[PDB]
Amino acid sequence: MILKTNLFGHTYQFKSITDVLAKANEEKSGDRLAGVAAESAEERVAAKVVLSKMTLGDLRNNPVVPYETDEVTRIIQDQVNDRIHDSIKNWTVEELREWILDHKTTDADIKRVARGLTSEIIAAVTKLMSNLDLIYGAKKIRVIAHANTTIGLPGTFSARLQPNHPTDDPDGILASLMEGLTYGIGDAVIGLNPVDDSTDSVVRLLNKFEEFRSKWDVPTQTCVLAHVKTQMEAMRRGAPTGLVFQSIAGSEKGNTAFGFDGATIEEARQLALQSGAATGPNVMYFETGQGSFGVDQVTMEARCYGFAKKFDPFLVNTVVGFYDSKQVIRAGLEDHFMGKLTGISMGCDVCYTNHMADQNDVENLSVLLTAAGCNFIMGIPHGDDVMLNYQTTGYHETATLRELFGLKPIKEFDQWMEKMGFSENGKLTSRAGDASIFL
Amino acid sequence: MILKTNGHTYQFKSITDVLAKANEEKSGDRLAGVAAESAEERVAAKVVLSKMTLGDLRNNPVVPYETDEVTRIIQDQVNDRIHDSIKNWTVEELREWILDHKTTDADIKRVARGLTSEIIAAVTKLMSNLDLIYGAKKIRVIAHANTTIGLPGTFSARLQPNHPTDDPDGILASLMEGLTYGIGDAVIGLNPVDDSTDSVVRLLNKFEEFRSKWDVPTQTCVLAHVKTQMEAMRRGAPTGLVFQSIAGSEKGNTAFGFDGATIEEARQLALQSGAATGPNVMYFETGQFGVDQVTMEARCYGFAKKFDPFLVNTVVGFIGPEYLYDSKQVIRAGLEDHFMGKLTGISMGCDVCYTNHMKADQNDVENLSVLLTAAGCNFIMGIPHGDDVMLNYQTTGYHETATLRELFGLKPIKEFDQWMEKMGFSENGKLTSRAGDASIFLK
Amino acid sequence: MILKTNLFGHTYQFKSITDVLAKANEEKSGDRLAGVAAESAEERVAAKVVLSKMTLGDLRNNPVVPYETDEVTRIIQDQVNDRIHDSIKNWTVEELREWILDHKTTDADIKRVARGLTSEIIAAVTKLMSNLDLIYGAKKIRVIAHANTTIGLPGTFSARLQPNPTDDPDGILASLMEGLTYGIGDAVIGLNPVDDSTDSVVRLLNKFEEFRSKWDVPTQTCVLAHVKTQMEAMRRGAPTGLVFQSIAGSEKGNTAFGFDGATIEEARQLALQSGAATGPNVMYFETGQFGVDQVTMEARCYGFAKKFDPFLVNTVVPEYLYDSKQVIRAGLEDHFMGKLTGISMGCDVCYTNHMKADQNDVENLSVLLTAAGCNFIMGIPHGVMLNYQTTGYHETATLRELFGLKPIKEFDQWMEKMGFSENGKLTSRAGDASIFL
């Protein structure tokens, strides 16, 4: 294959596909720090030109971590329909891009072609797309999934309810939960990322979370975001969970560092279907984000999505961190699109402190992702002040974002809200922020 | 009025100072020395500005009524009765109220009668980007030249080819291409290289022949000096609109070569012998001593409101010192400008400048354009800049505008949309295979 | 410009444009009494023929009252866009008529042509239109205005609440409340006071606004005194939504009414600076019937009114009636010319139940006007205690229901918040002013 372009008055040769994929990315902090980024704006345009002419055959057959060496590569590659791929193998990345964006190409068509794609291809096409392409292209693509209720339907926008609190103090958590419900937060999931993630603490929390949900008959899913194996361990001890969560990576090496493999995730899925509190079939909740190999962040993100797709998740959130702020927006839009095209329920967690990284930047991305058909987004505030983080909730801003686009919580949760008097025809009432009805 | 606040006593030198230090970090303000010394100070300025009554800002324009015509024009638009009823409202209260569910667009428009540009700038300074999006969406503003711009479910765009030499065939090509993507429903014009009265005249008649040839429901304009256009008009050359770059101070306007009385003359002249049905025939361009960029921006709208324009485009740019600049500021200013203008009651758009060497330099423009379109902005245009004058002419933005419309399900102005369908360029809002194909014009 | 024609059997020559305008009108009482009418039905057809072939430029250039002499002609003529007018100057009156009434011709088109028209052209085209043309032709045209709320939107029908004895407070008050329960007063809540002294107007405005604010009624208030009286009342701090003045089609008429162009504009700006309406449309004008005919004079009031972008423009319309049809004809003409001029056109109908008009005639004209797209109509009984109680509230309500119209949006929302109506239909609380007292 070529890997060389003369544009303009200078021949640029690239070492490999991995090199071309990496240098074809827009400016990214992590790639720069790893030495894989483009040495100039001109070299980056060259990478993009080279990539645009690369065929889907070449990319599919040369995954950036070999098949014999990496389980994630095998999981990704084993999902391909070889017959479908064979008919698109001679298409170029740029032809794939144009085809995906064309008027006459439908969500159904795209899902058919997805069967002939791999994470490296998804990754590749994303790099040749503009921010408006990533938005318009992702909107075209519908992805839905069902645990207790169905996420992803047009006209809806969902939100995870996960109170912080440094101590995980029962009162502070409960208070944040109830307030959150009044704003319509918690239809995607109701949960906690616990400080004490011992098997017994997870057992205690899961039990408490289902007691609360069952009390108020909230149509949603519960999930304690500890290690996959700890949640499984709690579930074998009789604790109910709606979803099973795990942070994931784009390599076998990466997942091993996190403490699991495909078999482990598959065992958790079968255990949740057998004994979980959710109807199913979508019971996994995965977290990605870069990173923790010579391969770029975008391509490795794609590969996480390809791993995730194998286990039919209810949710798959990336984590982007708010050097120009435009990078974070770009990342969020890329993630969201690669994931929608991969066919997974994709969301996005946006971290912030305040460093030209503020709440305004988070809002910029949020609005952009919502125009893209992203069904769940959540700001994650950081800072030395652990109490402004707990109190900075994003509940009111999410209600606002919904109203702006005219979206509602998942159908059954929106019905629950009207029965509680917290909302009416999508818009919140005077009871918003008023958790009195619970007490 | 109190200009102090707290575990540290912060104090400000004036209203002009608080307005300035209350802003979000901006390089133009920072380089002009007016910005805040820290985030703690910024938060402090916002707190002081938030407890300030509307009467205090109404009575304390950042440029004196005695001195400056812009200040008078702003202040003379106020209804003293309505202002009186709200004079004791605090700035934070005005923000809350604007954003509240029970508060409607007609309510806002009423309260705007008792407001001034300094107050409009004051409230904007206390709003997050989401507030500026959601709050501007609430506000509808329409204007009618030959057609009505501003209606919900629509999005309009200027057709303004930037050929380096103003080659008649380079323009004719770009114009016809644009029309096939549905561009030019807001206005068909040129910012010409030769802005001489005889040039402007030649241009105005050429554009008019072309528009009239294809019976294109829109307006024409040549973005020159208001005085150049008037001469051209007095010689018998037709114009849909009359353009003028404006400023937020008499000095600024005087520097630009005109005053309030020049714009009224231009306006009444357009109503007398212009090619637009009217009443809205003015087309202003805004964009940025001791007064911050936002407050000055507000004051241009306050100026422009008096002349009921068809369009008022701010100009923001993804160009800058590189080390002191961040894209967020360009986004924030666009969102701010749009809100303030909509709150002022003017048909408000936004021109976005960018260093155009890569296709990825447009990502920044697209970010803002999507945020603004979600806020109800009915017209946005990209302006390519850089040493490559011919790429700038090729970087047309037509396809990207058509895609922006389909993303939100918007169409061009009603009559133009009807023209598009009669020409075969679109159907129920979406373009056809004919998009880009100038053949129907040549055949 | 020919002014002769052979009305097949005789040759009729006319003195001037003024003469031909006048003779083309159908039989009108004032025009007859003034000696400007046609001597025979045959010379009226001849008048029309001549008018029909007359070009628009000729009409624009020759106003019935000279530009050098008359303010109203200048106010009218200075509003013309010469450029637009130049394109149509060779159109005839008949041709202009045809064009208004064409399927393919839109409200937007008509608004562009209006800019090249004048009151004498508006008058002329109307003189050649049938009653259906005036109804249909006007239906096509939408005119909206905004003071506190917006009058003129389609699907709405607005009404004035202006209590008619000795300026009795107990009886004015009771009339307001009873009026609001039927949904009267979305256009404006006013009063034509017997005592039109500045002091009296100031007392009235303060009480009207006190009441309106108390009940939070979304509408405009206005005391129908002299413009200069209202202006002084405003300078003393009295709040008014609209500013009222009867106006005429000549500088002599306005001068006789006691005001001029600068007075009206001084009033307009005053309302904008300290009125209680949001605006921009704050003026409320009354019109209605030299050697110039009634109709052409009417058209000229509208052109005058237009320069001041009024919220409302009511025209007023029994012993000298050759037939009641003339009242119906007058109203349809007035509405068309007002809509063609681009003004919020309303209509006040007078009746004394005479053999030729008569409450049933005020219904004929009302239903006809409502089909015409008229958004404001009011009945005015003449000849004291049976005229205050002769209300028109129930008739107004039944008219809306007949056409499926509602009051102005905000006022309609207030009607439902008050339990007086539901979806434009009144409830059992209609007439029952208990919610107030």
Coordinates of N, CA, C and O in Angstrom, one line a residue, chain C residues 115-214:
Chain C
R115 N -46.9 50.8 -1.6 CA -45.8 51.8 -1.5 C -45.8 52.8 -2.6 O -45.2 53.9 -2.5
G116 N -46.3 52.4 -3.8 CA -46.3 53.2 -5.0 C -47.7 53.8 -5.2 O -48.0 54.4 -6.2
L117 N -48.6 53.7 -4.2 CA -49.9 54.2 -4.3 C -50.1 55.4 -3.4 O -49.3 55.7 -2.5
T118 N -51.2 56.1 -3.6 CA -51.7 57.2 -2.8 C -53.1 57.0 -2.5 O -53.8 56.2 -3.1
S119 N -53.6 57.8 -1.5 CA -55.0 57.8 -1.1 C -55.9 58.0 -2.3 O -57.0 57.3 -2.3
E120 N -55.6 58.8 -3.3 CA -56.5 59.0 -4.5 C -56.5 57.8 -5.4 O -57.5 57.6 -6.1
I121 N -55.4 57.0 -5.4 CA -55.4 55.8 -6.1 C -56.2 54.7 -5.4 O -57.1 54.1 -5.9
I122 N -56.0 54.6 -4.1 CA -56.8 53.7 -3.2 C -58.2 54.0 -3.3 O -59.1 53.1 -3.5
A123 N -58.6 55.3 -3.3 CA -60.0 55.7 -3.5 C -60.5 55.2 -4.9 O -61.6 54.7 -5.0
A124 N -59.8 55.5 -5.9 CA -60.1 55.2 -7.3 C -60.4 53.8 -7.5 O -61.4 53.5 -8.2
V125 N -59.5 52.9 -7.1 CA -59.7 51.5 -7.3 C -60.9 51.0 -6.6 O -61.7 50.2 -7.2
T126 N -61.1 51.4 -5.4 CA -62.3 51.1 -4.6 C -63.6 51.5 -5.3 O -64.5 50.7 -5.3
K127 N -63.6 52.7 -5.9 CA -64.8 53.2 -6.6 C -65.2 52.2 -7.7 O -66.4 52.2 -8.1
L128 N -64.3 51.4 -8.2 CA -64.6 50.4 -9.3 C -64.7 49.0 -8.9 O -64.8 48.1 -9.7
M129 N -64.8 48.7 -7.6 CA -64.9 47.4 -7.0 C -66.3 47.1 -6.5 O -66.9 48.0 -6.0
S130 N -66.8 45.8 -6.6 CA -68.1 45.5 -6.2 C -68.0 45.3 -4.7 O -67.0 45.4 -4.1
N131 N -69.1 44.9 -4.0 CA -69.1 44.6 -2.6 C -68.3 43.4 -2.3 O -67.6 43.3 -1.2
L132 N -68.4 42.4 -3.2 CA -67.7 41.1 -2.9 C -66.2 41.4 -3.1 O -65.4 40.8 -2.3
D133 N -65.8 42.3 -4.0 CA -64.4 42.6 -4.2 C -63.8 43.2 -3.0 O -62.7 43.0 -2.6
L134 N -64.6 44.1 -2.4 CA -64.2 44.8 -1.1 C -64.0 43.8 0.1 O -63.2 44.0 0.9
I135 N -64.9 42.8 0.1 CA -64.8 41.8 1.2 C -63.6 40.8 0.9 O -62.7 40.7 1.7
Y136 N -63.7 40.2 -0.2 CA -62.6 39.2 -0.6 C -61.3 39.9 -0.7 O -60.3 39.5 0.0
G137 N -61.2 41.0 -1.5 CA -60.0 41.8 -1.6 C -59.4 42.2 -0.3 O -58.2 42.2 -0.2
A138 N -60.2 42.6 0.7 CA -59.7 43.0 2.0 C -59.3 41.8 2.9 O -58.4 41.9 3.8
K139 N -60.1 40.7 2.7 CA -59.8 39.4 3.4 C -58.3 39.0 3.2 O -57.6 38.8 4.2
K140 N -57.9 39.1 2.0 CA -56.5 38.9 1.5 C -55.4 39.6 2.3 O -54.2 39.3 2.2
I141 N -55.8 40.8 2.9 CA -54.8 41.7 3.5 C -54.8 41.6 5.0 O -55.9 41.8 5.7
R142 N -53.6 41.4 5.6 CA -53.4 41.3 7.0 C -52.7 42.5 7.5 O -51.7 42.9 6.9
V143 N -53.2 43.1 8.5 CA -52.6 44.2 9.1 C -52.6 43.9 10.6 O -53.7 43.7 11.1
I144 N -51.5 44.0 11.3 CA -51.4 43.8 12.7 C -50.7 45.1 13.3 O -50.0 45.8 12.6
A145 N -51.0 45.3 14.6 CA -50.4 46.4 15.3 C -50.3 46.0 16.7 O -51.0 45.2 17.2
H146 N -49.3 46.6 17.4 CA -49.1 46.2 18.8 C -48.9 47.4 19.7 O -48.0 48.2 19.5
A147 N -49.8 47.4 20.7 CA -49.7 48.5 21.8 C -49.2 47.7 23.0 O -48.0 47.7 23.3
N148 N -50.2 47.2 23.8 CA -49.8 46.3 24.9 C -49.9 44.9 24.3 O -49.0 44.1 24.6
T149 N -50.9 44.6 23.5 CA -51.1 43.3 22.9 C -51.2 43.6 21.4 O -51.4 44.7 21.0
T150 N -51.3 42.5 20.6 CA -51.4 42.6 19.2 C -52.8 42.4 18.6 O -53.4 41.4 18.9
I151 N -53.3 43.4 17.9 CA -54.5 43.4 17.3 C -54.3 43.0 15.8 O -53.2 43.3 15.3
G152 N -55.2 42.3 15.2 CA -55.1 42.0 13.7 C -54.8 40.6 13.3 O -54.9 40.3 12.1
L153 N -54.4 39.8 14.2 CA -54.0 38.4 13.8 C -55.2 37.6 13.4 O -56.3 37.9 13.8
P154 N -55.0 36.7 12.5 CA -56.1 35.9 11.9 C -56.6 35.0 13.0 O -55.9 34.4 13.8
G155 N -57.9 34.8 13.0 CA -58.6 34.0 14.0 C -59.0 34.8 15.2 O -59.7 34.3 16.1
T156 N -58.7 36.1 15.2 CA -59.1 37.0 16.4 C -60.1 38.0 15.9 O -60.2 38.4 14.8
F157 N -60.9 38.4 16.9 CA -61.9 39.5 16.7 C -61.9 40.3 18.0 O -62.1 39.7 19.1
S158 N -61.5 41.6 17.8 CA -61.4 42.5 19.0 C -62.5 43.4 19.1 O -63.3 43.7 18.2
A159 N -62.7 44.0 20.3 CA -63.8 44.9 20.6 C -63.3 45.9 21.6 O -62.5 45.7 22.5
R160 N -63.9 47.1 21.5 CA -63.7 48.2 22.3 C -64.7 48.2 23.5 O -65.9 47.9 23.3
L161 N -64.2 48.6 24.7 CA -65.1 48.7 25.9 C -65.1 50.1 26.3 O -64.2 50.6 27.0
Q162 N -66.1 50.9 25.8 CA -66.2 52.3 26.0 C -67.6 52.7 26.5 O -68.5 53.1 25.7
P163 N -67.9 52.5 27.8 CA -69.2 52.8 28.5 C -69.8 54.1 28.2 O -69.2 55.2 28.5
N164 N -71.0 54.1 27.6 CA -71.8 55.3 27.2 C -72.3 56.1 28.5 O -73.5 56.0 28.8
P165 N -73.7 58.5 30.4 CA -75.0 59.2 30.8 C -74.6 60.6 31.2 O -74.9 61.6 30.5
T166 N -74.1 60.7 32.4 CA -73.6 62.0 33.0 C -72.1 61.7 33.5 O -71.7 62.3 34.5
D167 N -71.4 60.8 32.8 CA -70.1 60.4 33.2 C -70.2 59.7 34.6 O -69.3 59.8 35.4
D168 N -71.3 58.9 34.8 CA -71.6 58.3 36.0 C -70.6 57.2 36.5 O -70.5 56.1 35.8
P169 N -69.8 57.4 37.5 CA -68.8 56.4 38.0 C -69.3 54.9 38.3 O -68.8 53.9 37.8
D170 N -70.4 54.9 39.0 CA -71.1 53.6 39.4 C -71.5 52.8 38.2 O -71.4 51.6 38.1
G171 N -72.1 53.6 37.2 CA -72.5 53.0 35.9 C -71.5 52.7 34.8 O -71.7 51.8 34.0
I172 N -70.4 53.5 34.9 CA -69.2 53.2 34.0 C -68.6 51.9 34.4 O -68.4 51.0 33.7
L173 N -68.2 51.9 35.7 CA -67.6 50.8 36.4 C -68.4 49.5 36.2 O -67.8 48.5 35.7
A174 N -69.7 49.5 36.5 CA -70.5 48.3 36.2 C -70.5 47.9 34.8 O -70.6 46.7 34.5
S175 N -70.5 48.8 33.9 CA -70.5 48.6 32.4 C -69.1 47.9 32.0 O -69.1 47.0 31.2
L176 N -68.0 48.3 32.6 CA -66.7 47.7 32.3 C -66.7 46.2 32.6 O -66.5 45.3 31.8
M177 N -67.0 45.9 33.9 CA -67.1 44.6 34.4 C -68.0 43.6 33.7 O -67.7 42.5 33.3
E178 N -69.2 44.1 33.4 CA -70.2 43.4 32.6 C -69.6 43.2 31.2 O -69.8 42.1 30.7
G179 N -68.9 44.1 30.7 CA -68.3 44.0 29.4 C -67.2 43.0 29.3 O -67.1 42.3 28.3
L180 N -66.4 42.9 30.3 CA -65.2 42.0 30.4 C -65.7 40.5 30.5 O -65.0 39.6 30.2
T181 N -66.9 40.3 31.1 CA -67.4 39.0 31.3 C -67.8 38.4 29.9 O -67.9 37.2 29.8
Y182 N -68.1 39.3 28.9 CA -68.4 38.8 27.6 C -67.2 38.9 26.7 O -67.3 38.5 25.5
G183 N -66.1 39.4 27.2 CA -64.9 39.4 26.4 C -64.8 40.6 25.6 O -64.2 40.6 24.5
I184 N -65.3 41.8 26.1 CA -65.2 43.0 25.4 C -64.1 43.8 26.0 O -64.0 43.9 27.3
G185 N -63.3 44.5 25.2 CA -62.2 45.3 25.8 C -60.8 44.9 25.5 O -59.8 45.3 26.1
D186 N -60.6 43.9 24.6 CA -59.2 43.5 24.2 C -58.6 44.5 23.3 O -57.4 44.7 23.3
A187 N -59.4 45.2 22.4 CA -58.8 46.2 21.6 C -58.4 47.4 22.4 O -57.3 47.9 22.4
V188 N -59.3 47.9 23.3 CA -59.0 49.0 24.2 C -60.2 49.2 25.1 O -61.3 48.8 24.9
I189 N -59.8 49.7 26.3 CA -60.7 50.0 27.4 C -60.7 51.5 27.5 O -59.7 52.1 28.1
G190 N -61.7 52.2 26.9 CA -61.8 53.7 26.9 C -63.0 54.3 27.5 O -63.8 53.7 28.2
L191 N -63.2 55.6 27.1 CA -64.3 56.4 27.5 C -64.2 57.7 26.7 O -63.2 58.3 26.7
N192 N -65.4 58.1 26.2 CA -65.5 59.4 25.5 C -66.2 60.2 26.6 O -67.4 60.2 26.7
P193 N -65.5 61.1 27.3 CA -66.1 61.7 28.5 C -66.8 63.0 28.1 O -66.5 63.6 27.1
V194 N -67.9 63.3 28.9 CA -68.6 64.5 28.6 C -67.7 65.6 29.1 O -67.4 66.6 28.3
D195 N -67.1 65.5 30.3 CA -66.1 66.4 30.8 C -64.8 66.1 30.3 O -64.0 65.3 30.8
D196 N -64.4 66.7 29.1 CA -63.1 66.5 28.5 C -62.0 67.5 28.9 O -61.2 67.8 28.1
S197 N -62.1 67.9 30.2 CA -61.1 68.9 30.7 C -59.9 68.1 31.1 O -60.0 66.9 31.3
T198 N -58.8 68.7 31.1 CA -57.6 68.0 31.4 C -57.8 67.3 32.7 O -57.6 66.1 32.8
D199 N -58.2 68.0 33.8 CA -58.4 67.4 35.1 C -59.3 66.2 35.0 O -59.0 65.2 35.7
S200 N -60.3 66.2 34.2 CA -61.2 65.1 34.1 C -60.6 63.9 33.5 O -60.7 62.8 34.0
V201 N -59.8 64.1 32.4 CA -59.1 63.1 31.8 C -58.1 62.5 32.7 O -58.0 61.2 32.7
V202 N -57.4 63.3 33.5 CA -56.4 62.8 34.4 C -57.0 61.8 35.4 O -56.4 60.8 35.8
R203 N -58.2 62.2 35.9 CA -58.9 61.4 36.9 C -59.3 60.1 36.3 O -59.1 59.0 36.8
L204 N -59.8 60.2 35.0 CA -60.3 59.0 34.3 C -59.1 58.0 34.0 O -59.2 56.8 34.4
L205 N -58.0 58.5 33.5 CA -56.9 57.6 33.1 C -56.3 56.9 34.3 O -56.0 55.7 34.3
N206 N -56.2 57.6 35.5 CA -55.7 57.0 36.7 C -56.6 55.8 37.2 O -56.1 54.8 37.6
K207 N -57.9 56.1 37.1 CA -58.9 55.0 37.6 C -58.9 53.9 36.6 O -59.0 52.7 37.1
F208 N -58.9 54.1 35.3 CA -58.9 53.1 34.3 C -57.6 52.2 34.4 O -57.7 51.0 34.3
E209 N -56.5 52.8 34.6 CA -55.3 52.1 34.8 C -55.2 51.4 36.1 O -54.7 50.3 36.3
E210 N -55.8 52.0 37.2 CA -55.9 51.4 38.5 C -56.6 50.1 38.4 O -56.2 49.0 38.8
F211 N -57.8 50.2 37.7 CA -58.6 49.0 37.5 C -58.0 48.0 36.7 O -57.9 46.8 37.1
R212 N -57.4 48.4 35.5 CA -56.7 47.4 34.6 C -55.6 46.7 35.3 O -55.5 45.5 35.2
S213 N -54.7 47.4 35.9 CA -53.6 46.8 36.7 C -54.1 45.9 37.9 O -53.5 44.9 38.1
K214 N -55.1 46.4 38.6 CA -55.7 45.6 39.7 C -56.1 44.2 39.2 O -55.7 43.2 39.8

